Enzyme design. Structure first.
Site, PDB file in Angstrom:
ATOM      1  N   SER A 150       1.916  20.882  66.432  1.00  0.00           N
ATOM      2  CA  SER A 150       0.910  21.957  66.358  1.00  0.00           C
ATOM      3  C   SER A 150      -0.368  21.463  65.646  1.00  0.00           C
ATOM      4  O   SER A 150      -0.862  20.390  65.956  1.00  0.00           O
ATOM      5  CB  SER A 150       1.533  23.195  65.669  1.00  0.00           C
ATOM      6  OG  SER A 150       0.693  24.336  65.742  1.00  0.00           O
ATOM      7  N   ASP A 333       3.754  25.516  77.343  1.00  0.00           N
ATOM      8  CA  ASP A 333       3.045  25.998  76.161  1.00  0.00           C
ATOM      9  C   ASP A 333       1.548  26.224  76.458  1.00  0.00           C
ATOM     10  O   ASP A 333       0.914  25.411  77.137  1.00  0.00           O
ATOM     11  CB  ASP A 333       3.186  24.993  75.012  1.00  0.00           C
ATOM     12  CG  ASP A 333       2.347  25.374  73.791  1.00  0.00           C
ATOM     13  OD1 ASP A 333       2.156  26.578  73.562  1.00  0.00           O
ATOM     14  OD2 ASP A 333       1.834  24.471  73.095  1.00  0.00           O
ATOM     15  N   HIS A 390       5.964  25.395  72.994  1.00  0.00           N
ATOM     16  CA  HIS A 390       5.279  24.852  71.825  1.00  0.00           C
ATOM     17  C   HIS A 390       6.240  24.144  70.880  1.00  0.00           C
ATOM     18  O   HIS A 390       5.846  23.202  70.196  1.00  0.00           O
ATOM     19  CB  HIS A 390       4.566  25.997  71.074  1.00  0.00           C
ATOM     20  CG  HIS A 390       3.527  25.546  70.097  1.00  0.00           C
ATOM     21  ND1 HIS A 390       2.425  24.819  70.472  1.00  0.00           N
ATOM     22  CD2 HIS A 390       3.409  25.748  68.769  1.00  0.00           C
ATOM     23  CE1 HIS A 390       1.687  24.560  69.409  1.00  0.00           C
ATOM     24  NE2 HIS A 390       2.263  25.109  68.361  1.00  0.00           N
TER      25      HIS A 390
END
Ligand SMILES: *[C@@H]1O[C@H](CO)[C@@H](O[C@@H]2O[C@H](CO)[C@@H](O[C@@H]3O[C@H](CO)[C@@H](O)[C@H](O)[C@@H]3O)[C@H](O)[C@H]2NC(C)=O)[C@H](O)[C@H]1NC(C)=O
Ligand SMILES: *[C@@H]1O[C@H](CO)[C@@H](O)[C@H](O)[C@H]1NC(C)=O
Ligand SMILES: *[C@@H]1O[C@H](CO)[C@@H](O)[C@H](O)[C@H]1NC(C)=O
Ligand SMILES: *[C@@H]1O[C@H](CO)[C@@H](O)[C@H](O)[C@H]1NC(C)=O
Lengths: 413, 413
Positions: A150, A333, A390
């Site tokens: 991330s 994602d 993700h």
């Protein structure tokens, strides 16, 4: 090893771990103290590498990584029971889960001022990594990898550069999962993503083309056309603010269609667990500290983003050619879509080694399957995880483990 | 109702159906005899509509539809047990599953010549539908819908046109699931699909653009550029011939990575069941007929495709404006990808009614979720099913039922 930091009996385990694990605090810059959780390799700590894992946010905890992604054990939905994880990354590595920056999770500072920024966080992690090896000198020799997810697409390369400067640290590589490497590519690629995954339709696609694009290139990043902006806003609303799961488009959004949780994410299981006073005690957490949250709204809201692209850092890490780099992405994602990072890697212009192909995983009964696609350059690979969101290790643990194992072992994917 | 065709006790059911069901033969053209399986609405047959369901292929059986998609009961993996289906389409409709054309499944002809073509099959189905109402005159009044999947994107509109000519038949609408409406749009859209779902990468994407596209309108359909062909062949190999599940990209390919089965499809469960001599008996199948296969290679290999686009047929059906039309698509299917059909519908130029939006489904505990997107025009709607493959009712039964229920009931989705 700091003995007092050793974790003795961890609530929610039926049987105690075969491996040592420690939990305590690393000194960062100033008066900042970062909580760490170190899980020794299940197979030969003294010759297994040292992996740093950072979750992103900014403001979110790396104990999410441990407890819901690839730790030796994962918290179960009752918030109480931990079950061992057969695909845990500490099967073949010493994984250091670090809560950062100051204020996230159980990490704090004496002055409690938690406004910070990319350069300060980089330095803070670097100094904490330094403090780690003072406390764990017997791990100074081990191969050292920096890994994250991330927003750690920013944390990790910026950190790595600092680590690159210190040859006492045995940096061998870094890996970033659905990372934020470039806002511009992320943003432009997301919009294509949205159309071609069926979220936009043709009237809106036409408008976007008309107002944001001239003949063979679009600007969906910082376009000043006011009609383009109105449409980008619509796209932003569809993708992020209308009921879809931005982390994983084909997954339901936790808790229906409308403290900072990540969106569409239930954080009850982990929070329930880590706020148990006995768990805090087991993890040598001082009592006076506030409750644990997966993310800190303060941190996130007060956070100043400085780097707009990791292009420099990566070339700077690639020039030396001592370092093995992986960018991997879940291909469903929308937070950090796979294409953005494929574009980002491709635009590094490295010497192509292996051409783009499938990569496989063996499953029980199913036989070999395609887990995703991989494109290798010298020292840097891009790779997808088909049907993962993700948080790759959650959606596809086995594939995530395989990838990681093959990364650690300098092996073809 | 032909009493002798009634299905008495069907092997593999714990408890017998609350509804009547019949299985026998409808006369087509020449000496062709099509096997049918009719399941009465579980809720008031006399006032529930009449739905024809055709699977595509060409050469594949509509009993797949029944037994693995939306029949009242679905065959289980042991090939022996049938379990009721809580999302079955015959909850609110009289569903007529028709094995066609001649030679598919239990359908045959006296002369056994099974080479055929779109115009002949259309006529054959039409005549079989005629023969149906001779046998089931009490259902001549009921609302009549024509529904199909896959290659039935050709079967259904072509059929509908013939039905449109006969005002004795009470045609109210038609629905097509991941249909083949236009080869050109299907083929062009698939290639974009492949790139933007992460299968192609940039070198190949560039080549394709270069050789198959000038000034941002591509020909991936019938392009004569020899360098384009070499690349389209590569795309064809990646999509269809390299381990992926063409019916559902995020699903594993049945039986690892390498009689006509559909590709990546295990047809054991259904075949095992329907070849049971007692099942054939229960379904009034004459003994001398060959074994049941989900598809017939002969039919498929000997099949002559004539219509290249259903544009005429749909406008011809829309002009009258008596008919309510739905095209729905699983948005992770690559056999008949959603965009191809979205383009096809959009290019019909009808009066837009409802602008493109989400549509929801209520789940147990999960609350409301986005099941897909819908774009309505006058008498014709396009709609996706998020995270569903080529066979919508299998991948997403509840969403498929909802859609269907709302279709039957002239309701907003
Ligand atoms: C990102 O945050 C870092 C760390 O806060 C910023 O660097 C720091 O900048 C502050 C003021 O902006 C400096 O404060 C000064 O402290 C010294 C103490 O000797 C004093 O000379 C001044 O009175 C003032 O109080 C601080 O020195 C400085 N720290 C470092 C390590 O450089 C950085 O500027 C921030 N970046 C951005 C773009 O906002
Ligand atoms: C979140 O998780 C907790 C326990 O794990 C559960 O009680 C709660 O119902 C969950 N919420 C949703 C929306 O799933
Ligand atoms: C196909 O299905 C049968 C029955 O469900 C199962 O036993 C078998 O394992 C499957 N075959 C393959 C190749 O997956
Ligand atoms: C299609 O089949 C019919 C019936 O056999 C035949 O009359 C006709 O010539 C065929 N069409 C073509 C294009 O071959």
């Amino acid at each position: 090893a700091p003995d007092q930091d050793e974790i003795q009996r961890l609530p929610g385990l039926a049987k105690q771990p075969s491996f040592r694990q420690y939990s305590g605090y690393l000194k960062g810059s100033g008066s900042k103290h970062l909580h760490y959780w170190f899980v020794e390799s299940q197979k030969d700590p003294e010759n297994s590498p040292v992996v740093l894992w950072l979750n992103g946010g900014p403001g979110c905890s790396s104990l999410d990584g441990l407890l819901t992604e690839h730790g030796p054990f994962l918290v179960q939905p009752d918030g109480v029971t931990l079950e061992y994880n057969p695909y845990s990354w500490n099967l073949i590595a010493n994984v250091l889960y670090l809560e950062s920056p100051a204020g996230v999770g159980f990490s704090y500072s004496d002055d409690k001022f938690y406004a910070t920024n990319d350069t300060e966080v980089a330095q803070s992690n670097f100094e904490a990594l330094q403090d780690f090896f003072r406390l764990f000198p017997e791990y100074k020799n081990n191969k050292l990898f920096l890994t994250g997810e991330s927003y750690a697409g920013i944390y990790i390369p910026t950190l790595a550069v600092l680590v690159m400067q210190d040859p006492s640290m045995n940096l061998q590589g870094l890996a970033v999962g659905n990372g934020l490497s470039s806002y511009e590519q992320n943003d432009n690629s997301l919009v294509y993503f949205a159309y071609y995954h069926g979220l936009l339709g043709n009237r809106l696609w036409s408008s976007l083309q008309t107002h944001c694009c001239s003949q063979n290139k679009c600007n969906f990043y910082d376009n000043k056309d006011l009609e383009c902006v109105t449409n980008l806003q619509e796209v932003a609303r569809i993708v992020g603010n209308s009921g879809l799961n931005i982390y994983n488009l084909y997954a339901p959004c936790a808790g229906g269609v409308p403290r900072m949780d990540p969106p569409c994410t239930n954080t009850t299981a982990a929070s329930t667990y880590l706020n148990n006073p006995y768990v805090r005690k087991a993890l040598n957490i001082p009592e006076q500290l506030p409750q644990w949250d997966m993310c800190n709204f303060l941190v996130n809201l007060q956070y100043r983003r400085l780097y707009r692209s990791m292009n420099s850092q990566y070339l700077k890490l690639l020039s030396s050619q001592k370092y093995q780099i992986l960018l991997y992405n879940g291909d469903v994602d929308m937070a950090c879509n796979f294409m953005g990072d494929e574009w980002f890697v491709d635009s590094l212009n490295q010497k192509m080694e292996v051409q783009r192909r499938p990569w496989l995983v063996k499953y029980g009964d199913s036989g070999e399957q395609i887990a995703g696609f991989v494109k290798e350059f010298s020292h840097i690979a891009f790779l997808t995880i088909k049907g993962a969101g993700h948080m790759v290790p959650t959606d596809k643990p086995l594939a995530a483990f395989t990838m990681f194992s093959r990364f650690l072992n300098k092996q073809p994917y």
